[PDB]
Amino acid sequence: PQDLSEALKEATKEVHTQAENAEFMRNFQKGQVTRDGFKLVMASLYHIYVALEEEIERNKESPVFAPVYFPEELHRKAALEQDLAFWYGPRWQEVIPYTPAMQRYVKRLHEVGRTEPELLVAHAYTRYLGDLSGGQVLKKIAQKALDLPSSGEGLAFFTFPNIASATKFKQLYRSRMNSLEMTPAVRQRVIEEAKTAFLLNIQLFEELQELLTH
Ligand code: HEM
């Protein structure tokens, strides 16, 4: 369509369903998520956001990204650090896994941020708008299945404290995305990069599912 935000949503409808159908995600949705499985998901998110946010900081003043730069409202690294200290303990940095599928995702994020910055918006869209939009449903399931202790920690990732209304922010973020100026060639590569982002998540899900079935 005309608006990039609408173009992205329509172009990734197929791959989003592919993600919903992923065996690992099917189990999650059926409420069949285990503590070991959830831990792997949180570790994955930590590596992904560390890379994404490092690249966002590198390109925050570039015209290809500045319009969608919302550090305070969206940053997730600190929240994940808090969560991993709960899930993996005080020495989480020394024990969290960093698997090949996690590395493939991180590698692409760095390649984009360092050599193809104009495509970073595709990854910011896929991750941020995705976790913002589906965070409520994804969290509700986890907490009711994890039966975790009332220790007030472990799920900070699912709350964006600097966004008072997800509805208002998503409209603003979409408006900013649509304000970005890019050639038709770039626009097509951004759309493709968004699909690539979903595929990287899907391959990660497949790897995690394999690691858990031994
Ligand atoms: C367990 C599987 C998943 C569930 C159940 C889920 C759920 C949701 C929900 C409820 C929405 C809101 C749709 C609407 O009402 O307009 C959504 C949007 C979205 N999701 Fe997911 N999601 C899943 C996996 C993923 C994955 C793996 C990604 C990518 C990392 C992702 C990226 C997105 C994006 C980018 C949107 C924004 C759509 C837009 O442009 O409006 N989701 N998701």
Delimit the domains of the chain by residue range: 1-214
Q: What is the Cα gyration radius of the chain? A: 17
**One-letter amino acid identity for 125?**
Y
Nearest residue CA, atom 32 of ligand 1? 130
Q: Would you say the C-alpha torsion 43, 166, 206, 193 has a positive or negative sign?
A: negative
For residue 5, the SS3 value is helix
Experimental method: X-ray
Amino acid identity, residue 29? Answer: Q
Q: How far is the CA of 195 from the centre of ligand 1 (A)?
A: 13
**Which tokens in the block code for residue 83?**
């969560």
Instruction: Name the closest-CA residue to atom 6, ligand 1.
Output: 134
Read off the DSSP letter of residue 67. G
Question: Would you put residue 3 in left (φ > 0), alpha (ψ -120 to 50) or beta?
Answer: beta
Residues near 8 by beta carbon (within 8 Å), at least 6 away in sequence: 122, 125, 177, 190, 191, 194
| Residue 18 one-letter amino acid | Q
Q: How far is the CA of 94 from the centre of ligand 1 (A)?
A: 31
The CA 194 to ligand 1 mean position distance, Å, reads: 12
SS3 at position 153: coil
Which residues are documented as binding site for heme b? 9, 16, 125, 174
Q: How far apart, in Å, are the Cα atoms of 44 and each of 4, 5, 9, 70, 121?
A: 28, 26, 24, 22, 20
Other beta carbons within 10 angstroms of residue 73's beta carbon come to: 16
Say if residues 206 and 100 touch (Cβ distance below 8 Å).
no
Instruction: Tell me 62's DSSP state.
Output: S
Reduced to 3 states (helix: H, G, I; strand: E, B; else coil), residue 65 is coil
- CA distances in angstroms from 111 to 89, 126, 199, listed in the order given: 32, 17, 16
Exposure on the CB side of residue 51, measured as CA atoms within 13 A: 23
Choose one of 41, 44, 133, 209 to mutate for the ligand 1 pocket test, by most ligand atoms within 8 angstroms of C-beta.
Answer: 133
70: amino acid identity, one letter: F
Q: What torsion do the CA atoms of 208, 40, 150, 78 make, to the nearest 10 degrees?
A: -140
The CA dihedral of 9, 66, 169, 187, to the nearest 10 degrees, is: -10
Residue pair 15/198 in contact by the 8 Å Cβ criterion:
yes
Binding-site entries: 9, 16, 125, 174
Contact 17, 201 (CB under 8 A): no
Q: What residues does ligand 1 touch, defined as CB less than 6 Å away?
A: 8-9, 16, 19-20, 25, 28-29, 125-127, 129-130, 133-134, 137, 198, 201
Query: What tokens appear for 184 in the block?
Result: 């038709």
Are 209 and 24 in contact, with CB atoms under 8 Å apart? Answer: yes
1-214 — its CATH code?
A: 1.20.910.10
